[PDB]
């Protein structure tokens, strides 16, 4: 089910394409 990666994986790759 997508309600742990759209909130990990999702989120997760947004913030590891926003910080530095």
């Known amino acids: ?3 742990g ?3 990990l ?3 997760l ?3 590891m ?3 530095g």
């Open 1 to 3: 089910h997508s309600k």
């Open 5 to 7: 990666l759209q909130i």
């Open 9 to 11: 994986g999702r989120t």
């Open 13 to 15: 790759k947004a913030s």
């Open 17 to 19: 394409r926003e910080l």
